[PDB]
Design a protein around this nucleic acid. Sequence first.
DNA 1: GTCCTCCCCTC
DNA 2: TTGAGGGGAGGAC
Length: 510
Amino acid sequence: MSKFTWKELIQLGSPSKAYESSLACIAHIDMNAFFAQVEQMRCGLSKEDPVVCVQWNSIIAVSYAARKYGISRMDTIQEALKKCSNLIPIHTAVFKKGEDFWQYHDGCGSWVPAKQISVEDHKVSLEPYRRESRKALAIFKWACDLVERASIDEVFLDLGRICFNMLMFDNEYELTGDLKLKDALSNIREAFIGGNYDINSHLPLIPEKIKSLKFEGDVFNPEGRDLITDWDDVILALGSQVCKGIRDSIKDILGYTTSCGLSSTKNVCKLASNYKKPDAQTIVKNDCLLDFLDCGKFEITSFWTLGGVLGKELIDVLDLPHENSIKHIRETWPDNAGQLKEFLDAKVKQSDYDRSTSNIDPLKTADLAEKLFKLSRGRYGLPLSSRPVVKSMMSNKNLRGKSCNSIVDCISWLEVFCAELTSRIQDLEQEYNKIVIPRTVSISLKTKSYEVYRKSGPVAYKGINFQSHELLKVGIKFVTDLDIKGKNKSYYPLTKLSMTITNFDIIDLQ
DNA sequence: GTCCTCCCCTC
DNA sequence: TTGAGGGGAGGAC
Ligand SMILES: Nc1ncnc2c1ncn2[C@H]1C[C@H](O)[C@@H](COP(=O)(O)OP(=O)(O)OP(=O)(O)O)O1
Ligand SMILES: [Mg+2]
Ligand SMILES: [Mg+2]
């Protein structure tokens, strides 16, 4: 019989539990060369124009046209110009200190007179990118009932309902000119409509006729395994068809190309979306999970949450090798996560451990073992969270020279931050029909000696027309407080100043 | 009980 | 890098 149960299939129809099914169909979609594509589209340029988006002197995004020249993100604009004479460098929008609005200064930059965009007198605006991100999000949410915005240019989609409904109910989809999906799937549809199945019983064996169903995109398959051999493959393939449709809506409506990863889990999807770019969809079958994870590109540190100090501690505590760490984890504790838990409990129970400088929770070693056991097999299923309209907003200026050399300069930059945040808040209120209320503000700064000073606390609310004022009041309070705390110590000129609204109330309207 | 400060993760 | 942003522990209040 199938490896899968009626329970696992039917749970694809539940947004709260679909992710947990071995039959899950998740997509990760990442915008290609995002900031460069935004600038390309704003300036009416083409896929063939070698655009790079520039922030001060750094390339922050490189179009795929420009990458054909050898240009890489974080190249300096100087280096980029050597590699491509026809380069189209476009600087981010900016705010000018003393003004309360952002705009593009096209024709201006550190390349190029009276046309330089100085780091002393401006701050970056990323708002054109954020706007375009929210447009994309609207398109994704219209196509799919569960979408997680993972970062400015990434989303995850849970395709469970679309796949389930297509599998059971779609009477138009054609596999071939002589074969409809409804007829290929007559046995399973009969059983489902007949309703006479046990939720804990295994599914029938896939019908031979469903093997005509095609995947849309690149199926990762170096070992040449059979494409459709169980119901997970049927769902994944249907999912790839729908995902292509969604990605085409993004391309047709907004102009943006995407790369996409399709698999049963978020973690594998995120790896897969980065496998092939631009404008591509990489599909990882369950039976190809180990082939993919072990291709040589990935280590335990490639997994989300494991890319920093915890990951490095795990390499040391689990005596992981420098390469093929994923396979190592899998083969060293091959049967169950408890084997790994036992190993962890031993290392951590030792009196010479150091529990105050470790990122492993000794009380939660069952969860860590299960996470590593499953990640190493490509079967660690995390839920998608639908995020609120906004959670936090930051306005940040890293400062050069003496552009912030006294409390007067601090406040001058705070006025830019306050104007920016207020305009961002108004835009969200109009776009999403909400009242958006800052509740808590944090000021963070760095001295000339790079020492960090922070202060957070409540901000009062008196409506949108007084919002900038209410933010500034608290900011001025906090910067003057911190000035006192820095007396007789290395302080001015500052090397960084930022204001973040760290907590919002969101009121629904209509 | 919640708040503030400090910290870790990611693009 | 800079300029974002997500999240949580634990002592302060
Ligand atoms: N370290 C960073 N600092 C500031 N901005 C960044 C940084 N990394 C990425 N970005 C911005 C610019 C990118 O266009 C956007 C999305 O990031 P990312 O997906 O990593 O690259 P990308 O979309 O430019 O290229 P790709 O086609 O490889 O996805 O976020
Ligand atoms: Mg991208
Ligand atoms: Mg990204």
